[PDB]
Symmetry: C7
Subunit: 170 residues, 7 copies
């Protein structure tokens, strides 16, 4: 009854390091919610990032499932966490007020130099398409370490709407 | 029946270090209680603080949900714990008698100097608005380590009402 | 059925170190029992003490809840454990025969000198009011390490009644 | 059904080190069995001893509860384990054949010299009253390390009856 | 109801290191799903590889069971993970867009030289048959470390179809 | 249903080191099975031995309970494991074919010299009575390290019947 | 329902190191399946071997129970794993295609020289009888480290039938 009603909220929490264990847990939750109904799913994300391949799986699983996914950034959203956040369509990307964002991507993906370049190009294109920023702007910003405030992240094209209450997530 | 009646009390305990794990647990409890009814929720807080981003999430989740949240400070409330405590509206902020308060915030948030400054400014404004104290007073006090007694915390604008029994939380 | 009938006894055990984890567990049990009925609760305490803030929470939670709380000291009751024990009204403070008591309080509370003094003064006043001893007597005794026998603890005003059987807890 | 029928036997096992964790587990079992009925309880004890305060609690809890407690020594019963064993009335103290007994008590109770003496005097009187031996005999024997065979423990007044089968525990 | 509906999706996740523990878990899931119905099973694979013998078991179990197995590569698929991936028939081999592939096989299988050669020959033949590539091409590529993009893996004969949404897995 | 039918077999497994933890688990199983019915119990023993006092408890508990206990040696049965094995009556002592036996007993019981001698004498008499061997033969053999084959253990009087199939345990 | 239907498959997995813990788990599963019906049991074995006495128990338990046991080798089957594998009758011994076999037995059984010889002779005779190979051939091969391919293991008399699909296990 308790977990059953927790499933009824169609909410997924992605808090902490992005790793294969978290990717499995999130994948299971998303597949379970998909099998129940086509109703929208809300994901709250508080993550500093982690492993690139785990971030890739969560990103792709979000786009793969039939239900529309809304994301709500909270606390911080960085690196592989940003990749996950940007899986949702622009109009479905929300933020709580006390959140900072960083698109920096680890070079190794925390592998040869040719693969580091390929990985970077792939992620740069992903972020560019999702935000509406040019490839060159993203390429510069993924290779440095700067935090964006919630308002700056909105101006950047990461966050679409800043919300404080439930009625903003209508 | 046991956990079901524990949920009926609409009570959340925030005891110990503020971290992403605790933030997830608290977020789940708050979302679960919200889905059940719009009835008020009581949070008992005993925390020395912890990670800024986890504190930010809990703070924002308290304000995000529809139910009115009452907070009861107990033992100690410090740093990131203070940020969480101050998420409730002033008239909903209570304290048990044997509690001390400290608004000191860790510089690193336990990151570049520019971001340390930004983080401090954000938290200073948050605490100033919640307490009614000036920005300058808060800015001074977050950058030093001094404990306030329950009575001093009341005079400071952190605690609204000191309670010993159930009837005080009417 | 097993834990359900265990809850029917309205008994809470406080055995071992006083820490935030134990404080959370005890808080949950007390709140759960309160929500069921206003019937009295019995707490058996076997503790060497621990963390001051955790002791403060348990002490205050005992006084906060509506049900009358009876305490039964067993084995040993010391330091933060004494603070918890003294939360119950004098006529509700019992002891099993093979128990020793020590009111010694750790200076750091196991923090600046001004806060050590404040903490000590607060706890001294708490113990003085509960036992009926003068502030000066308590102040002397919290700053030294001496064990009281069950009979001496009774004479001191800590224990009200020494009991061996069930009929003594009528 | 399995644990429910295990509770129907009204049997408690005290195997291994006497510590606060074991004291809590045993206390819970004894209180649970008491709440069910006033029928006798059988305790099988295999213990080298442990912490004095934990032994004191179990000893006192055995005497505290309404049901009559029978004890069956098995393997070994020593030190704090002896204190627990002697909580039962003499005619309710049994032993399996392959058991050895030692009344040696650790000086520190595994604390000032005055308290070591007080502790020893208290435990000496306890053992003297339970066994029927003089204080002087017990005082000598608690301060040395000698094992008694099951027959010697019977002659000493520790064990009342040596049993091999169920019918002996009638 | 929750795990029951999770089983209804007939989905298996192979995330992380390929070891005997994972092989047991996957074997149990595949056998359980087979016993329920002959309906198709979908496996999502995110793995860097691991132990050759565990990979061999999962590969063979996929081919052993009656249900048709579809595989979906996600994040990365390498080494022993590739061996597992290639257990499915070519037309049942899918990939999510953000995935890289590497057919490199560890020489020791992470054992004498004669057995290293035998192992390599066996795996080379397996990969050659599944992909349609010549033995010589596979032999070269398993003995070097190069990552294939999702498009290159498709051209290589590893991936048959790249999918972004549910409708592509019709 | 699964553990319920596992209890219906009235089978207890004693595999691995003989310690107080295993003694507690075995004691609980034997008492549970006794409370259900007076039907025979089968114990499979694969043990190198362990702690003497734990072996003594299991030995005595086997003889204490009302149901007839059959033992089946498997793999190896040594030291404290032999003491347990010999708790069953001779005609109820079976062995699987691939089993070796050793009656060697550790001097310390893995304690003063006088107690080492007493312990050895007690165990020697126990083994002599169970096997039908003279005290002198047992005394020699417990103080050396020699393995008996299943056939030699039968000739020694440890094993009564060697069985390969179910029908031999009629 | 999930584990209940998993039991309906009458399948046991022996994956990883052969130890007393695994022997207990396998023994419990085999006894449980035997108590349900006399229907055949299938065992999938992926094991490098381990402890001789644990292997002996599993081997003997397979032969002891009434149901006919079929074995399926997968990944690798070596040493103590080979002993277990050979417990099944020749016509019930199957292999998945990607499996290697090694009959090497550790001298110590991973103990005096006389016992090493006895152990080796016992295991040599066991393997000789099961495979149809001469004692001399087995004696040579257990004392060296050489891997057999699935086809070589078939020619050796270890594997009877190589299967790829379900219909081969008819």
């Amino acid at each position: 009854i308790l977990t059953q009603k927790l499933i009824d909220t169609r909410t997924v929490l992605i808090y902490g390091e992005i790793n294969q264990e978290l990717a499995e847990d999130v994948s299971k939750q998303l597949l379970l919610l998909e099998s129940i109904s086509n109703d929208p799913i809300t994901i709250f994300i508080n993550s500093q990032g982690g492993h690139v391949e785990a971030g890739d799986t969560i990103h792709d699983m979000i786009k793969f499932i039939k239900p529309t996914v809304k994301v709500v950034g909270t606390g911080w959203v960085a690196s592989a966490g940003i990749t996950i956040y940007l899986a949702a369509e622009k109009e479905n990307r929300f933020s709580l007020p006390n959140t900072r964002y960083m698109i920096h991507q680890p070079a190794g993906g925390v592998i040869e130099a040719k693969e580091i370049i390929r990985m970077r190009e792939r992620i740069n294109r992903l972020i560019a398409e999702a935000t509406g920023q040019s490839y060159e702007q993203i390429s510069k910003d993924t290779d440095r370490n700067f935090w964006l405030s919630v308002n700056e992240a909105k101006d950047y094209g990461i966050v679409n709407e800043i919300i404080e209450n439930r009625d903003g997530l209508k």
